[PDB]
Amino acid sequence: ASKLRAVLEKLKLSRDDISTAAGMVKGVVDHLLLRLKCDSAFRGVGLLNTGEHVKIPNEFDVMFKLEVPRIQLEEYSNTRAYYFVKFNPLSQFLEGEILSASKMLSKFRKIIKEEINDIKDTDVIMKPAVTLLISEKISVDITLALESKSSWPASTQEGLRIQNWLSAKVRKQLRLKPFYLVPKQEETWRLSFSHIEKEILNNHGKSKTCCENKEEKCCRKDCLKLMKYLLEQLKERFKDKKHLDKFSSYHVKTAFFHVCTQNPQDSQWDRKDLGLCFDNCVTYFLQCLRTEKLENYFIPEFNLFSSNLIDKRSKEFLTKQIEYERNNEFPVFD
Ligand SMILES: [Zn+2]
């Protein structure tokens, strides 16, 4: 309780520094926004949202969207999340009727690499996305996404189980918004709902006025922040072995969404209960590791904790560490 509020207070001390690390990212991103818009295949390129951190802070995430009419999806080998694209200026990227991720992605690179070599002032360099490093500290991941305005694919029909939490009316309204395809067969694309993830986090209560007044302060955002921070701290400490580096804040974010579904009432996230809500988040994540199952929140048959993605040994390792931390009141938080 008191230890975790001290952690949150420390994290806030870093906020008047993102304000200068994110401001520098953004100006490099609008500079590419223009050059892409000058290429004939990336003319309807824009930004998705305003406008994410995997490290919470030197990793920054920006997604470039791109409207593509006449979309058509073919599910790669009933993997639920991976698709080929079929149907214009994008005809240069197709290999036999289907849209080639690797071709479209590889010209994305050339155009950006052509540009970071022309910003002579700031020392930006290049190193599922393209990673830039602005002036030796803060990097950014730039992801290209295709936008489709059609109904969501069949593998999402049982996902986004927010009915008992955010209501069926909101689930209806969210599923009319577009969805996105990100390049990972190497010509396959992966569903992305980053835009929905952000909206659910910022409009996160059963009560429409959750966190808009002093009588309704939940600790939902503070639990996700602690969870992401727990993982970051553990990865730093276990860097002599580096067998935690398959895990990412997106696993924590997904697990936190499942816990929101389990604890749908704002009274289960009362700020006074920070210690117990955080514990709820950690034990669920723990169960995900021990069962080797972490369902993508939108695609239930897509297991992020598969053996394909993360081997058994790494999950066993993180289990033993999180288990020890939870049974000892998180000494990793000092
Ligand atoms: Zn709230």
Author numbering: 162 to 212, 216 to 220, 223 to 253, 260 to 299, 306 to 362, 371 to 520
Question: Which statements did the authors publish about this structure?
Answer:
Cyclic GMP-AMP (cGAMP) synthase (cGAS) is essential for the host defense against cytosolic double-stranded (ds)DNA arising from various maladies (e.g., pathogen invasion, ionizing irradiation, and genotoxic chemicals). Upon directly binding to and dimerizing on dsDNA, cGAS cyclizes ATP and GTP into 2′−5′/3′−5′-linked cGAMP, a unique metazoan second messenger for initiating type-I interferon (IFN-I)-mediated inflammatory responses. cGAS is central to antitumor immunity, host defense against an array of pathogens, and regulating autoimmunity. Here, we resolve these numerous fundamental mechanistic questions in innate immunology and present a unifying catalytic mechanism of cGAS. Finally, we reveal how mouse cGAS achieves more stringent substrate selectivity and higher catalytic efficiency than the human enzyme. Together, we set forth a unifying catalytic mechanism of cGAS in which dsDNA-binding pre-organizes the active site into a rigid yet adaptable lock for two sets of keys (substrates and intermediate) necessary to specifically synthesize 2′−5/3′−5′-cGAMP.
To further examine these discrepancies, we crystallized and solved the structure of the catalytic domain of human cGAS (hcGAScat). We noted that, unlike the mouse enzyme, the three β-sheets do not move upon dsDNA binding, while the catalytic residues assume different rotamer conformations. However, the activation loop in our structure was mostly disordered (thus not modeled in Fig. 1D and Supplementary Fig. 1A). Comparing the B-factors of hcGAScat structures with or without bound dsDNA revealed that, while the C-lobe remains steady (likely via dimerization/crystal contact), dsDNA drastically stabilizes the N-lobe containing the activation loop and the catalytic residues. Together, our observations suggest that, instead of being fixed into a specific autoinhibited conformation, the active site of resting cGAS assumes an array of inactive states and its activation entails a dsDNA-dependent disorder-to-order transition. D An overlay of dsDNA-free and dsDNA-bound WT-hcGAScat structures.
